[PDB]
Amino acid sequence: MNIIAIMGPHGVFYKDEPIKELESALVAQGFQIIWPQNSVDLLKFIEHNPRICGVIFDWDEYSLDLCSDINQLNEYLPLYAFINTHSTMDVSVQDMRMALWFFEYALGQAEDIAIRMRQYTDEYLDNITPPFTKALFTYVKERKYTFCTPGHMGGTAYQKSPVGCLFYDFFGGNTLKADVSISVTELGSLLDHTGPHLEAEEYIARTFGAEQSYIVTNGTSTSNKIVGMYAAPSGSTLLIDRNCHKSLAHLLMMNDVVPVWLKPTRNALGILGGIPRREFTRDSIEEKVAATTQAQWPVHAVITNSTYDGLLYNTDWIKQTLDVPSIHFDSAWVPYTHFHPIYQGKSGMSGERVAGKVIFETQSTHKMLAALSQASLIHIKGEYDEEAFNEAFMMHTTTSPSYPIVASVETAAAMLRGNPGKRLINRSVERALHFRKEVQRLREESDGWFFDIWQPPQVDEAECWPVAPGEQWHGFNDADADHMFLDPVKVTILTPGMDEQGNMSEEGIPAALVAKFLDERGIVVEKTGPYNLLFLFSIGIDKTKAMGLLRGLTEFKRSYDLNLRIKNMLPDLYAEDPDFYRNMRIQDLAQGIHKLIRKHDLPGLMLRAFDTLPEMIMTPHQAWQRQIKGEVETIALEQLVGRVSANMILPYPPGVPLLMPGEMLTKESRTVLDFLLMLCSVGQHYPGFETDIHGAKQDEDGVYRVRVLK
Amino acid sequence: MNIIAIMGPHGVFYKDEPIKELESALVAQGFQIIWPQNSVDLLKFIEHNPRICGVIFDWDEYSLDLCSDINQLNEYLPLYAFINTHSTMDVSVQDMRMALWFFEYALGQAEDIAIRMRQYTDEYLDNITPPFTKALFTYVKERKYTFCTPGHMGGTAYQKSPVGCLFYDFFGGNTLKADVSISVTELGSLLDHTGPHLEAEEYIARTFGAEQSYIVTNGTSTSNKIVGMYAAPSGSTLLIDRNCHKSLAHLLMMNDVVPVWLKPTRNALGILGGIPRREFTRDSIEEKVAATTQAQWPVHAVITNSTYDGLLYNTDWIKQTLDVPSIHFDSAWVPYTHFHPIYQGKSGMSGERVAGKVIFETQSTHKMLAALSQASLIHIKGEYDEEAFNEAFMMHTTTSPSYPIVASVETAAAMLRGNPGKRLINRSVERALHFRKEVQRLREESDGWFFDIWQPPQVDEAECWPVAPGEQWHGFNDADADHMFLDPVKVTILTPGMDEQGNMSEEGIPAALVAKFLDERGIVVEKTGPYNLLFLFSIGIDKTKAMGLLRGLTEFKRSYDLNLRIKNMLPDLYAEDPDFYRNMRIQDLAQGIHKLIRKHDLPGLMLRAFDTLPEMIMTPHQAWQRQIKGEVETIALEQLVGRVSANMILPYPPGVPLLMPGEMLTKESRTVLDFLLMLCSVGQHYPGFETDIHGAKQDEDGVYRVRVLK
Amino acid sequence: MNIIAIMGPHGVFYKDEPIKELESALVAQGFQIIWPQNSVDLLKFIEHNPRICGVIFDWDEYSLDLCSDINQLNEYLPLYAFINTHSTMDVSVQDMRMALWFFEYALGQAEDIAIRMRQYTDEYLDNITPPFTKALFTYVKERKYTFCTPGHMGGTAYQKSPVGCLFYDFFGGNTLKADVSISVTELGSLLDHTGPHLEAEEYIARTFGAEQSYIVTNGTSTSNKIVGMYAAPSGST
């Protein structure tokens, strides 16, 4: 933050000489001086360069032309207005939010003006910077306690080592110095939620419209367990989305609770649909209580809002309808809902309290917004026993917290604050839609096959496009209306291979092939299925990355139609097994893999595998008690029927739990095993296209084993 | 790493010109050239500057004088030897470990020599750098995957914000870029312990003499819970040191186990002594089993080795004697025992396996060595069910691990490796002893009162000085010999106030006064009691810091004897309450606080408070079940007798648990309450000298409340 | 291959300053910067100078006027397009064979952009350079086997002689270093037609529409005799 813009040659020494003296006084204070051509050039310079921290201009020449325009971009931006004798104040000044200092063109005034600019820059920074970070930065820069640990003291210990010196130089001083302890008493304590730490938590809770917010330094994986353990006593019944993150599976292994699963829907693609409205009604739950051994009325419920694929719930409907005292929205996917009105009545925090209920959102701040890994928030809307909740929090938090992680969580909030924050999301929304329109346009214009997007036939509107029963694009049968909506930011592309029905085509290009092509160009794919790929249009995503991906996709088709040798098109793939890939051409590779899917009837097997549930012999907790005594053994996957599984089995595809600890596959549910076996069989043919099943142990000879109770 | 040392003017153009050409070729590659005066100056330059990465010298002039001396400091240091026509190879070369390249003095050879120096520097770096860090650094520097998250991508998202740009600039690029995900597939996975991660874990386990090592990214606070939960099934009995860290108290709240406490000793000062030998004998344990409701034979035992005050156990004695299948040494204080032979048979990992037992050390790598906060190790010696142990590990680890924390844990090992690692600890030991001798010397030489160190009357030896029954310095009665030893690095200083017996003097200077004086000079105190202060002589501690503390101590006495106004000597204290401290002088402050201790008979009350245990009505787990249903209320501290406490109460002093969750103070154990009340009473008089009781809630009016069962 | 052409003064600091910072970052990497007058001057500069390995230009100002014209001369030529906020992608991009990187005008982006230009220049070179020559050049530049012959090793033996030093200097290092043996095992063998040598022969045979091609190192004078002797038994007509 050291670029000052001056706007203009005037052609008079009485004005120019004082500016020359000011240039010299500013260089003495180590400012860089920049000269925008005109008003437009300045506005773009401000818009693109946050380091622009001051503007000098003749008052009469620019004030009536600049003040409103600059206010719109940066309310706080230093203006240094030089007045004429006859300058006056128009009524336009009275109600505008401007930050103006008035200066005269005079020799020997530069020393005082330069000090005022420095002092005013600090006042601007002090206003916009958050309180804890401002204190932290001041300590790191200024402070010198001695007779103190840490013993390394700003990473001093690292510099005494040959490799240590390389390590120190790589990470830098700030990273080393930021590693502090509670010996810095003026910053208070995280664990106590005292001093500046309390100020930080209130800052966060205000920005996100929460009653109270906790900063977690071990990710939402831990945030879920803090909420979960405080909320679910042993021997209680919980309602849990079968579509749950692994951390909730681990929660079950750690807590003595009885799960009753909310049951999602699914289509032919193998994409998960929302928990239908009937799942929340008293009639459905009352019967589930009767059907669960020892079950009582649920004390706590966990709902994933939105779904991974961007299906949002009417949260007003759930809060009003669901007859459970404790409702937890795992909102790790939707931390940005408070920033666009399109999400009204579609987020956990939206609206007011629910009398006699406590409502939670847990959010993974990292890679959902911008924050360091392990940074997570718990947002509470309702009442908790403060002392008891803090005991639960301290039970899972170390006594040696990382102060940078804490600061990064607070600074993540600083990013989303103010008008620049709102203007960021408005920009990302417009770019997300723009890209969707370009895909649909290129699909219409191109000759023969092209990529398509899984969405309404027309998205000429800016909204979370509702799933309508009168539309076939989504491929769900008799969808509930006014229920599930498509988040614009969660973009799913589809590759040729399956019909509109969910029927199989003769010609197909498995998405796995495109994924390998994309890696040659250093493009990450978040999630892939048989014929789909997921991309996340974050705030970091600019027009360059969108065009790079868009052009990269047209280049894939270009090279594909050439029918290049895999050796030439995918050299990194070829290198994996030169003999296997010696004479294979790109079109044969696509046809060969599609043929395996066709022969194995993968889509049909995947549908039938998830249609009937494994039987819950005992709870995951009860089964883990046997495992604690080391009463497990490994069996081949083929010999798992009639055995009690000890681990969760999580196959990719379709990346959702298939078997839980305590469940047993029987003759009734043999299709489950047939799907898993098919994944291991199909996956053995092509180097680089290996099976991927979390919970199964692949042996050197390519046989799989699972753990079961003796 | 860019400083090259050249050693010499020769007075011949045939040698000098080629060196001039080499200087120019090296500057072109951005090396800095340094010229040590002679052999001694070079050795000091190497010793003090790890960035010295090459030495040029005439072979005949120096080889017989340098080779052994340099080998001793740096086995790997580049030598660029310039040969004469008649140079020969003495037998001294044959068995020495040297890294030599031979060059001729010739024009137009510099391009190839310079490339060889670059290539050889990389080969030197490649040899000494650990495998994962070398790959990580190469990725961070070189790599460019696109169509990837994280969305911020090297902190790009931060730069779009005004405050975000300040935040980015403060932390720097490397800190931002190092925030990665598993999308970087070539680095494998932490959670899977695969690829370079397995290589890193084997590197660590080898350096620390463990069977297997796990890297934990939530500190030893979490490492204790991973080991604890895998090790102690519900309804089992554990032996636990009453002198346990808070994380073990939290473990009890989280695990349904029945504690039987090992019972430490204590002296008049209130310093904890070791668990006597009788505590480990079958006779003592057999009776404890009979005395504990529902207890069976202990399945797992936890011992704190060493004690905080540096008492080490004969671990060979414990491993051989203790009839428990699972023994866990919380060795958070002694991670360095593998590096000095003085610790033989005094560490958990020392020696071999114990048939039919599993032995663990958990170590807080940070501030016990040098590593980032939250970095912790679990070391295992024996057999675990690998798949089951990893489930327990994954249950408490996030799905979004911090890659820098992981790298810092590995790099912490890199610091301790090789000959420089051994030469570091040898240096810290010699400095620790040197300081102890200077304190004892100044005590002998000075007129009247001076500081003393709590240790043997003579430490003219380098050893963990054994506590002998024929010595009175330690103030423990009938100490077991060949049992407890004083770690040289753990230095406790004492201030005047109490006799050798543990009797009270008329004159005294409470240590709290000295602690405030030390803060005026930016010296941290790790731990303080009524008349003691603890300092940790880490590897970061140099001779400058030792002298600063030593001089700071003599300055305190100098100013103290002047009897300066507190307003002048302790201006920051005076500012806290100008009216209270207006006319008070330093000697009156010391006398006034000592008088409160004398009147309140603090030492006597503190001894009696810990003599009789609160009664365990129910386990901390059973009591927490009632708290989960919100069946707690707050009572004044004064009204706690006959109530079931809900929280642990941890008073400072003496910083050890006084009451546990589930325990009840009765008329039998009223002294416990009297001590706590005395702490609140004595603590109310002096601003800056407030009561400090974790577990008690101080109200605005200075009344305290605790939580109890209804 | 080190001449970069930049096309234009814009009259705005927000665009010009970032280009100044880029000029400095590029000079640090030892690039020469050249400034063609206009589109025609650029096209002639490209046409006449194969060492032109990159072009910087404002996207909106030139893309619709340049992309087809440049594609016609050099499919592979680096373009460094600087975008405006409102820049869009016309259908003309979809089927054209372009090699585009999109950059923003921003301070402190030059280090990464300059590295991308270096990395992209290598990717361009790697695409157009033949496989064996690319490996050979990399060996000659990078490699250092010891306990090896030839004994002269990069013509070292020549430099020990008065006339030898004149001979070495006349022919140069590359000519001397290129004199290798089969000790460089990663290049395979000519006689065996193995490894990169087989790759080279297939490259040739493809370009000349042959079933199989052999590389002869004693001219067609010998090529005629190889074919002739294999083809004509004694006592035949």
Residue numbers in the entry:
A (entry chain E), B (entry chain E): 1 to 710
C (entry chain E): 1 to 237
Please quote the authors directly:
extracellular pH, and works in conjunction with a cognate inner membrane antiporter. excreted by the antiporter in exchange for a new amino acid substrate. that it is a decamer made of two pentameric rings. central pore, with the CTDs at the periphery.
for the polyamine production at neutral pH. decarboxylases have a similar enzymatic activity. between the inducible and the constitutive lysine decarboxylases. interacted with LdcI but was not capable of binding to LdcC. abolished by this procedure and no LdcIC-RavA complex could be detected. led to an assembly of the LdcCI-RavA complex.
